[PDB]
Every structure is written in C-alpha cells, then in structure tokens.
Symmetry: D3
Subunit: 133 residues, 6 copies
C-alpha cells in the first residue's frame, strides 16, 4: 500500500476534464485520502514542487502555466499506487504517450498535459509534504 501525489492541472479545468481524469483513477480502485482545491496555487509551492526542473529552459513557462488557473492536489492510496498511476498518466511527450493513457487520449502538448503524478516513493513523500504539510 503506497500513497502518491497527483495534481489536476489548470488545463483540466479549462477543458472540463477534471472528473474525466479523477474518474480514470477512481475506476482503477485507488482511493482518495487527502484532497485540496486551489483557486490559484501559490507560485512558491509550484516552484518547490518542480524544484528538480528549476534550471531548465521550460521552468518558468511551466510555473506560469501551473498558476494560470485552479488546481486540485490529491493524495491517492493503493497497492503500488505510484508506479500504477504513472502508467495511467502516460508519457510527457505527446508523440510518445499511448492511447488508453490519460495523456495519450486527452493531452496534445508537452506542457499542457493535464496531470502530475509523483515519480517515486521519495518524491511522493516530498510532494505530499508540500501540498499537505
């Protein structure tokens, strides 16, 4: 049994895909254990969340997008939740994400890509600590 941190990104709100995304996770039998809605996430939590990318060319553009509308931060629990939800999520690059995945079916951009999911046990603990201190 693991916990992972998911963000529903502002493009999901703009495109009315919030329930579509949450539903794919719900249907796989993962359970919500914490959830917060942010009308606009503070820039500082976004920069902390994406700290590994802070020196990347896309960092500022990505943070700008992440504060451009609401987000939901959710902690999901289930056996091997981290890797399983990453598989459901799909590749960042829309030339790579597979049909059947969230990004493969619904996203068409490397930045506006609908959903964040923790990529490891340690990053899940880190991200949970940011959004649910």
């Amino acid at each position: 049994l693991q916990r992972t941190l998911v963000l529903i990104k502002p493009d999901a709100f703009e495109r009315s895909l919030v329930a579509e995304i949450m539903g794919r996770i719900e249907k796989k039998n993962f359970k919500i254990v914490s959830m917060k809605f942010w009308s606009k996430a503070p820039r500082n939590l976004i920069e902390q969340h994406y700290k590994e990318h802070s020196e990347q060319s896309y960092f500022n553009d990505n943070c700008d997008f992440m504060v451009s509308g609401p987000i939901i931060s959710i902690v999901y629990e289930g056996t091997d939740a981290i890797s399983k939800i990453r598989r459901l999520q799909g590749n960042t690059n829309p030339l790579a994400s597979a049909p059947g995945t969230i990004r493969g079916d619904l996203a068409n951009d490397i930045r506006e890509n609908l959903i964040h999911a923790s990529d490891s046990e340690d990053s899940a603990v880190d991200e949970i600590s940011i959004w649910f201190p």
Copy 2:
C-alpha cells in the same frame, strides 16, 4: 451569481461514483469555488448541517450514514446555481427521482442518495458557513 453547497456522500465513495457525480455538474459548466475532502465528517457538523431535521424519525440514522465514510464538500458558483443543481440532483425518493438526474440514474434509496445540494438562498448561506467557516 449564486453559490450553492454540495456534499458528495459516503455511498458515492463506496460505489466509486465520485467522478461520475462531479462530472455531471462539471459538464453543466458550474465552477468550483471551494472544495474540501473529509475522511470522516465530525458528527456534530452533520447534525448542524441537518439541524432542520432534528425532530424527524430518520435524523439519527441519517447522521450515522453521513459519518460512515468520506464526504467531499464543494461550493459551486453559477447563475441560478442553487435551483439548477437541485434539478440535476433529483428527488430524494427513489419512487420519484427522474431518469437523467443523479439520483434518478444512480441512487436507489431514500437515505443513501449520493448527493446533498442546498435547497434555497437562505440555506446555501448557512451550509457554506458550516462547511467552509
């Protein structure tokens, strides 16, 4: 123009219908203003939410049900949101709830009825203050 208070009830979690219900409201173009997840709502909060029912024979049984699993409380905003969401919700009684409504399609019990929605301007003000003080 109006804000209303919605609860996603514990049966929605048991039956994995959280996204289904939220999605029906989302597709109608209502905006989330606030959202809280409760692993278990305090009984007192439930009793206050249903204070107008305190003399009804079903009061305690309904409170027991409402603390039997998680709840999500949501404030939705939209023109005439209160009455519109009530119509989407459907009648309490499963003999009457209309196909096409949330309860009409998904609920089969007078108590385990998936969703609460404020019934008026006066009660919306009260309920929002209870769940989001």
Copy 3:
C-alpha cells in the same frame, strides 16, 4: 423486496446496445437473480408472454420481431423494482419516451423498443414463471 422480469429484445443485439441497457439498470443498484440467453426464443413463449395482447392488431408483427434475433431474460430484485425499472425503461411510444430513459435515449420505434419490463406485481409473477419455470 420485489422481483421483476426484463427482456433485452432482439434490436438491442442488432444495434450492440445490450451492455448499454444492462448497465443503466446495474448503475441503479438492482441485483440480478436469474439470467438466461436465448439464441431465438420459441414463438409460443413469446405468444404467452404477450398473451394479453393477442387481440391487438400488432400482436403477430410484434411476435415476429421478438423471434427475429436473440433475447436475454433477466430477473432483477430490489425495493419497488417493478415500478422503478418501468420508469427507467420509458414509454412505449417514441413520441413520448423521455430523454434520460432507455427508450427515450436509444429507441425510435413503437415495436423495436429494446426492452421489456413487467408492469405490475401480478404480471411480474406470471412473466417470471414463463421465462424461468
């Protein structure tokens, strides 16, 4: 509390709507008690099922349709299941069947109308005994 008899009619098979119809009843939380698949129902069984219509001008044409492809017969159980499933079914006449109902959303003909459901306690008893002696 009540048991009702449902038939999934041959048009549902032709139009690949079997799961769609069954799913609407399933989502309403009704329990399957018995289920039979018929590659072709015997005409006599159909005539007995519709015996109250034997003097109607449509009787033979309706029997012809009912033996034109497969049928699934199902006994569903639930509180007040008979009237509830009738309301989900929708009116026979495509001028009247309400959007949100099975027929309202999916049927466009008075005869090729996808689904049978018992109309009363008395007829449910009779029909269950016909299909599941």
Copy 4:
C-alpha cells in the same frame, strides 16, 4: 418521414461537445441526410435563419454569438424527427431544460445553448432551404 435542420452552435466547438451532441442524436437512430461544416457562418445567413426573431431584444447579440466560431448544419431524417429532436434538445431556458436532454445536461445559458433544431414542419422546410439551397 420527416426531415429536420440541426445546427451545432459555436459553443459546442469551444467546449469540445460536438461529438457528444451528435452522438446523442446518432444513438436515437436518426439518419444524416446532409451535413455542412462552416468555419464561420455568414451573418446574413444567421439573420435569415433567425428572421422571426428580428424584433426581439436579443436578436443582434444572438447573431454575434452565432458567428463567433464554427457551426455544423445537419439535416436529419426519421419518423417524426422534428418533434423528437426538439425533445432531445431541451428547453431554451436553463431554469427549465430537463436533465437527460442536451441542454439540460450540457448548457447553462439561454443564448449559448449548444444546438438549434427546427420547431415545426413549416420551419424545417425553410431552414433546410437556407442551409442547403
């Protein structure tokens, strides 16, 4: 037996509901006879389509909306198609449109209401001639 004229309005394109709307009509078993895509309909065509509303206070605002994005115009054929598609469409007013209908489930505005459908035999003849001369 009857032919009716449907417009998929610019809000359906903005909100990515084109297939959702078309699918509801398709599932009802109506046949497409003609279909045109308009990147932007000429304003004059819109004014002619709504000529009976020319004296209403909303006339110009509604025309502005109708040329604000793409439209698909469709001729559908079926027995009593005109009234049946009107019932699927739902009432103009979001205080009244019934859950289960296109507008009841998906529209939340009197003007941005997703879909036009001819209201009578007389108007269907006129509208088909406007969109498909």
Copy 5:
C-alpha cells in the same frame, strides 16, 4: 470464426462493472452465443476450470474468491475471438496490464482481476464443455 469462454468474476458484480466489461467486448463486435448467470458457481466447476493451477500456492485462495459472489459464463464468437479477447483482457499482473485493456483500466489486483478468458483453442473447448455441457 472461433468461440472463447469468458467468466465475469465476482469482483465485477461487487464493483458494478459487469456491463462495463461486457460492453468492451460488445463494442469490438463479438457476439454472445451462450450465457449463464450463476448466483454462486459450484466449487467443483471452478476447480475443474482452473485445474492447471491445482498445485499452485494461490489455487485455494483463487477458488475461494471465485465462489465469493456471482459469476456469468459467456461464450463469445468472432474471427480469432480467443486471442483478441485475451488482448482486450490484459496481463494478470497489475504492474503489467496496459491502460486501454480491461484489467489495465479497471483491475488493481492479481487475483481480483474481473475477467477470465480462454487462453487457447483447446482450453476454450475444455472450458466451454465445463460451463455449457
């Protein structure tokens, strides 16, 4: 043209996914040729069905699960039905089953995995003989 044997497992009933699963197969254009509902499958047919696993550590636990609620046994027919339905089914291991498959989208356990499908021409004949003697 081949026939394959599918079981809808008790977790599908518990989670109200019976029609969801049958629908995925229906949408791929496979046809039902036999179907039986079992309120509780006899233990002996379950042990016969899974005879290859009789000496495995998981055999008893799996049989226990398979008699823990209802099942449906279905024979499906279509060109290369066996391999095609196995592909739709997805890997037993939820760390392996791909998004888009039945198990990839809906199952989260190696045992409670929603659906059985025959794995070969000879096992299909064997399994059909068990459930439809």
Copy 6:
C-alpha cells in the same frame, strides 16, 4: 501545426460509431477545419484516394466496401496531427491493433476498420486535394 485527412467509413455509420470516433479525436484537442458528408462517395474519388493500392488483391473489395454506405471526410488540424491521429487510429490488422486505439477497441476486420487517416505530410496534402479540391 499540421493538417490531416480522415475518412469515417461506412461501417461506422452502420454500427452507429460516427460520434464515438470523432469524439476520440475531439477529446485529443484536434480541431475540424473542413468536413463533408457523402451519402455515397463517388467510386472515382475512392480509387484516387487509394491509388497506391490499385494493383493489390484487396483493391476492388475495399473500394466496394467504401461505397457501400455514407462516409464523412474531415480535415483535422493540430500540432503533429498526422502522426498523432495515426497512433489513435491503430494497426490495420485486428491481430495487431492495441486496446485503447480506435481500431483496437472497436474494429474486428482488416477491411471494415472504421477510419482512414493520412499516413504522411505528402499523402495528407494529396488526400485533402481529392476530398476538398
């Protein structure tokens, strides 16, 4: 930003999957820029469209199928639309097309395979010129 040519094939009309297919493309955020409905495509445009296959064993059978009912020709626009829509489409061979793709989920035949999509930048320009001269 690229444009690609899609045909919705006659089997989609027969099986009432037109909106299902268009919806998968719509949900991926591709936009319609041209669309025509053909009650029956002229044989000559079909032969031109499939000119690369003119000497193949299956050419005539395929053309026969392509004029056996209506089609829709659609031009879709978006970043890397050509390759992305080809990935959504799935392999021609139903022993190869992956669950999650249009053909993987919905097609069960190498010829009656629901959808055409251009396979390259140059073939997209060629095909657009045929259907939208």
